[PDB]
């Protein structure tokens, strides 16, 4: 995985230095792998929150074992999807221009193009599926801290789990913060891959202006996402001895939600 990262940071150092045109993108098709993999990688991350957040609405319990192995699967599928809209631009250094800021020249981002909603969907999807994931960790990082029996390891998790303490009232504030965040990451990922759906459907192209892209890109993101959840849990269930937690009924139900999508 690290040698694959050295291929990542070298295909980026070659891209920044030589240009965005080492990609084989033509002028008719200016959007190639850089956007096929952006919509794919962000599509993977959407069924990691359908497990972590959308199933919390339905109060279902086949989500508990597959919670973090999918919620943390979202973030790292956004950390590889949040780079393509920051790197497929021909001038990546001016990617702060897609953000609203008083910047000594009266230009602001457009707010009519879905590449301007993307930087508002991807940046929200990042810093909400990170906080909802870090929220789901403070109780666990308190379990890792109390069971560490190793100074500077107990301090590491003791610093991440801020002061968790358990708590009768700290758990009620958690149950409402986790429900509302689940109730906010349900329309978020219904809109993040719907906004990513709209960087095709607002164009007058024949194969792109299909109006049913929002409830079909979302359905495609949940479709490709559960495939990646299964691809990453069959090894985590087999190699890591988690047969007593991620039971085969989780895959029976993930295979059905991957079918309903």
């Amino acid at each position: 995985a690290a040698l694959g990262l050295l291929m990542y940071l070298f295909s980026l150092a070659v891209l920044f230095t030589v240009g965005v045109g080492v990609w084989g993108i033509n002028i008719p098709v200016a959007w190639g792998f850089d956007i096929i993999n952006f919509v794919w990688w962000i599509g993977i991350g959407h069924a990691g929150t359908l497990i972590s957040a959308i199933l919390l609405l339905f109060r279902q319990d086949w989500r508990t074992s597959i919670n973090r192995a999918a919620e943390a699967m979202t973030i790292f599928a956004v950390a590889c999807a949040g780079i393509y809209p920051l790197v497929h631009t021909g001038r990546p250094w001016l990617d702060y221009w897609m953000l609203p800021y008083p910047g000594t020249l009266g230009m602001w981002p457009q707010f009519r193009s879905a590449l301007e909603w993307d930087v508002f969907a991807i940046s929200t999807y990042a810093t909400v599926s990170i906080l909802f994931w870090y929220l789901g960790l403070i109780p666990d990082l308190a379990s890792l801290r109390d069971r560490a029996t190793n100074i500077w390891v107990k301090r590491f998790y003791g610093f991440l789990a801020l002061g968790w303490r358990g708590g009768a009232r700290d758990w009620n504030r958690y149950e409402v913060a986790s429900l509302i965040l689940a109730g906010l990451s349900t329309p978020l990922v219904l809109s993040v891959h719907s906004i990513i759906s709209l960087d095709f459907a607002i164009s007058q192209l024949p194969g792109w202006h299909v109006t049913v892209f929002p409830p079909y890109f979302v359905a495609g993101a949940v479709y490709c996402g559960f495939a990646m959840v299964i691809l990453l849990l069959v090894p985590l269930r087999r190699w890591y001895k988690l047969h007593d937690l991620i039971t085969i009924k989780h895959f029976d139900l993930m295979g059905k939600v991957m079918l309903a999508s």
């Binding site: 045109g21 080492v22 002028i27 959007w31 631009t89 607002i202």
Partner: protein, 929 residues
């Protein structure tokens, strides 16, 4: 990747002594001309501050009525070409100029004891009056010296067929102002030929379809290779080019010419074309013409005058005059006459001025090996050509924007070539070189130019004439006077030979690269060839029938073996082409062109014969290749049912009966997205596709004006050509003989621009004047705008496209280092785009802003003809018309009301601001079906 907390301390250098004419920040157009084939074109070049920047046509010149050619437009890069010669080379070793005069005047004193016996000269078909007059001083100071004129493409047959039919030599001047029926056999007259611009406008001026037009030219073309005349041709016929020589003999027997004695029966469809043409020339006798191209043998040009004088075209349409060039008896026969003299060691001083025959030799005339059999062989060329590799001396060229010379266009209208800049490298042009041979070395070019024109000016003063000659450029006082002719018959009494069977290689000059003298020009090389949109490749074009016979594709690499010599050429199937015949392009494979045309393969000059120099029937194809790149820009060459959105076609048979016969009646389309009002200047364009002959001069005019970067062939095959304006061939139906239509595609400047709502940082926005503003600096390179653009006009600087033939764009060590010589050809009011920045045809805002601001400064409004876009005043046919739409008396708002007016892709309401006119193509009743 450049980065800095502050941009460097940019310096402001003023003049040391500012001229009384240079106002900093203003174009200051000049008036010069360019020797294309010895004949002038009459330019009007943008001289910003001493240096030229943009070449435009001189509206007072007959050879170019305000619009330039394709080669002529891109010859501002040929000047600002870093591969241009910068110092003379003595035997390859770089040397000074004053060392040449030491060893050139020492050769004249060695050529004076002998009465100038070995002072042969190989200029190429010069018509310059001051160069003719110095040729006269050289041939009387050295009486035995000879001056062989060799141009590889020039009038070798038309000038030898003119004296074959008339006795003495004549110079015909075809006029298409009054020509209802043109029948030009192999006539590529709307071509880079010296009369190409005028014969494109005078032919387009006949097919100006309007609200009430009923009579239009017909132009029967009869040509083996589809050419830029076949676009305007209404009945083009793919002929073998061996039948043309007796396809005119059939027309010269229907028209009554006494002793033609035709032979070699034609065809079922070539004969039906020659009866319908002759039955169309007998009607409207006085207003018609029978043109003949250069590829035909001299006996055909003799018949071209046998029919023109039979239809009474003399004095009306065809005008014979005194020969503008000095001697028309030179060319392929004069090159062989000198080469047989260079053999056996007769030549001692061989000044090859601009011909470059070591490359241009027909491969039967062994000039490469005949050279170096002489002791002293000079050369004065702007590029170190394949002769400079083999010649002893090589004087720098002094490109025509740096040389004090003159030209003489067709009909004799001399134009003083006017140096805009002093030569970047020490020039020493053809006049400053003969001054060394004549014996007056220290006498500059301007000194001899007035020392000749003070003799030729007998009327009035000189400074009232010389400056008026320099201001207008056109002197129009040496107009070639008419000449009574006789047309002595019997020239066709010789029977035509037995028709030879076999595939025929027809030798053709390349539209873009004429004869290889401009192969290092990256602008007219990246420019796509007209019918086959290839850019950096010479190919063997075959018809679809004569390639399915050989089992050939669009990418194979055949080995054309014609009379012993093999060339190993690619292949590109061309639907309009003729059966069992291939064509070639002149001037591609140059071992020493420079850094641009240095290895663009398939040198087609090594297949000629000097007896069959334009077409021959002894070819063996025998494919020996599998796959080639063949970077073409278009892609699909078929109107995929998308007529009414692409170029709409029709015919005058159904235009007189219903003017609005292709304007679809559609209701006002509903648009949720507001509506904005443009009460200021409403900048709109009206293209007339009826007259867009794909000259590709508008493609280079947008490059010369908008600093558009050349792209390598490796990145054009990837579909990354930077061309804001493109012409689209579409090949409707019957892939053996398809009609071909052009829709020159540029940025429509859509009012409901879909490419604007899709820029995240809001770079590309619309204007209050009404044209999509691409802002190259706010562009972060998202490149989404092209995907929303319905026409895919927006081109993206994917890599650092800048000086690309001089630095491969896939590097980055030099992508911030710019060639200092190239920085001058760039327009000082158009952004030189970096990488990662999309661009598009901006209606030349560099011309709208500089003219509106000049209008607001003077508190007046913009005149109708004051803002001409770069592609509008370069189109010879004047297809593109740009102007205010709110000005009711404008040539656009009176041109968008025509019944042919339509916009591309009106099914999606972009409200395009350019509105093409349909292609009405005047079919004959008894020839169509």
């Amino acid at each position: 990747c450049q980065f800095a907390l502050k941009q460097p301390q940019e310096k402001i250098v003023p003049y040391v002594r500012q001229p009384e004419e240079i106002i900093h920040g203003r174009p200051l157009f000049f008036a010069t001309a360019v020797t294309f084939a010895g004949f002038g074109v009459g330019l009007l070049v943008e001289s910003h501050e001493g240096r030229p920047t943009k070449i435009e046509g001189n509206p007072d010149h007959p050879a170019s009525l305000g619009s330039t050619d394709l080669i002529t437009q891109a010859m501002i890069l040929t000047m600002y070409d870093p591969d241009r010669s910068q110092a003379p080379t003595n035997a390859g070793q770089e040397t000074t100029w004053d060392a040449f005069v030491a060893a050139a005047t020492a050769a004249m004193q060695a050529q004076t004891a002998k009465q100038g016996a070995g002072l042969r000269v190989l200029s190429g078909s010069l018509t310059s009056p001051t160069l003719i007059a110095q040729k006269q001083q050289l041939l009387t100071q050295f009486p035995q010296a000879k001056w062989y004129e060799y141009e590889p493409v020039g009038r070798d047959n038309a000038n030898a067929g003119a004296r074959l039919a008339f006795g003495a030599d004549v110079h015909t001047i075809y006029r298409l102002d009054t020509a209802k029926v043109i029948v030009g056999f192999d006539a590529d007259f709307t071509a880079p030929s010296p009369t190409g611009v005028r014969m494109a406008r005078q032919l387009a001026d006949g097919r100006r379809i309007r609200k009430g037009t009923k009579e239009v030219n017909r132009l029967y073309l009869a040509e083996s290779t589809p050419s830029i005349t076949g676009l305007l041709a209404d009945h083009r016929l793919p002929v073998r080019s061996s039948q043309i020589e007796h396809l005119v003999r059939a027309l010269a027997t229907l028209v009554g010419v006494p002793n033609v004695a035709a032979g070699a029966p034609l065809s079922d469809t070539e004969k039906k074309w020659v009866e319908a043409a002759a039955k169309d020339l007998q009607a409207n006798r006085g207003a018609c013409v029978v043109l003949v191209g250069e590829s035909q043998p001299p006996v055909v040009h003799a018949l071209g005058h046998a029919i023109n004088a039979q239809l009474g075209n003399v004095g009306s349409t065809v005008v014979y005059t005194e020969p503008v060039e000095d001697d028309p008896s030179g060319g392929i026969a004069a090159l062989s006459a000198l080469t047989q003299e260079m053999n056996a060691g007769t030549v001692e001083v061989l000044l090859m001025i601009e011909s470059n025959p070591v490359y241009n030799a027909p491969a039967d005339i062994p000039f490469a090996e005949a050279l170096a059999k002489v002791p002293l062989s000079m050369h004065v060329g702007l590029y170190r050509d394949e002769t400079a590799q083999q010649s002893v001396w090589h004087i720098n060229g002094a490109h025509f924007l740096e040389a004090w010379g003159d030209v003489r266009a067709f009909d004799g209208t001399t134009t003083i070539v006017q140096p805009l800049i002093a030569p970047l490298y020490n020039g020493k042009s053809a006049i400053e070189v003969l001054n060394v041979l004549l014996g007056k070395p220290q006498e500059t070019g301007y000194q001899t130019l007035t020392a000749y024109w003070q003799t030729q000016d007998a009327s009035g003063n000189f400074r009232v004439f010389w400056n008026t000659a320099l201001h207008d450029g056109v002197i129009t006082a040496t107009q070639a006077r008419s000449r009574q002719v006789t047309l002595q018959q019997g020239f066709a009494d010789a029977a035509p030979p037995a028709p030879t069977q076999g595939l025929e290689i027809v030798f053709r000059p390349d539209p873009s690269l004429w004869d290889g003298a401009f192969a290092n020009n990256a602008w007219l090389q990246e420019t796509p060839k007209p019918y086959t949109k290839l850019t950096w490749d010479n190919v063997a074009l075959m018809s679809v029938r004569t390639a399915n016979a050989l089992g050939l594709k669009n990418g194979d690499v055949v080995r054309l073996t014609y009379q012993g010599r093999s060339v190993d050429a690619p292949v590109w199937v061309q639907p309009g082409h003729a059966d069992d015949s291939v064509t070639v392009h002149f001037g591609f494979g140059r071992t020493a062109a420079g850094r641009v045309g240095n290895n663009v393969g398939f040198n087609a000059y090594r297949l000629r014969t000097s007896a069959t120099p334009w077409f021959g029937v002894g070819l063996e194809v025998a494919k020996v290749g599998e796959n080639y790149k063949l970077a073409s820009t278009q892609g699909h060459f078929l109107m995929e049912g998308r007529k009414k959105d692409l170029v709409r076609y029709g015919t005058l048979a159904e235009y007189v009966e219903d003017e609005k016969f292709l304007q679809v009646e559609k209701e006002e389309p509903i648009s949720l997205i507001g509506e904005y009002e443009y009460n200021g200047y409403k900048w709109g364009m009206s293209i007339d596709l009826n007259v867009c002959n794909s000259c590709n001069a508008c493609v280079v005019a947008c490059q010369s004006e908008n600093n558009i970067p050349v792209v390598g062939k490796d990145e054009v095959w990837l579909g990354r050509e930077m061309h804001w304006i493109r012409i689209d061939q579409y090949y409707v139906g019957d892939e053996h003989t398809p009609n071909v239509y052009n829709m020159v595609m540029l940025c429509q400047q859509c009012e409901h621009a879909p490419c604007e709502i899709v820029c995240p940082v809001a770079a590309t926005v619309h204007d209050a004047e009404g044209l999509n503003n691409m802002v190259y600096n706010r562009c972060v390179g998202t490149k989404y705008c092209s995907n929303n653009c319905p026409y895919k006009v927006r081109r993206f600087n994917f890599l650092q496209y800048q000086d690309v033939p001089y630095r491969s764009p896939i590097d980055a060590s030099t992508e911030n280092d710019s060639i200092p010589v190239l920085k001058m050809m760039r327009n000082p009011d158009v952004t030189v785009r970096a990488r990662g920045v999309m661009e598009k045809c901006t209606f030349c805002v560099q011309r709208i802003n500089e003219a509106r601001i000049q209008a607001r400064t003077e508190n007046r409004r913009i005149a109708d003809g004051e803002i001409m876009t770069a592609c509008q005043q370069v189109c010879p046919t004047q297809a593109i018309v740009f102007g205010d739409l709110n000005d009711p008396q404008a040539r656009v708002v009176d041109l968008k009301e025509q019944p042919l007016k339509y916009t591309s892709l009106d099914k999606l309401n972009t409200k395009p601001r350019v509105s093409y006119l349909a292609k009405i193509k005047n079919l004959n009743p008894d020839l169509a079906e």
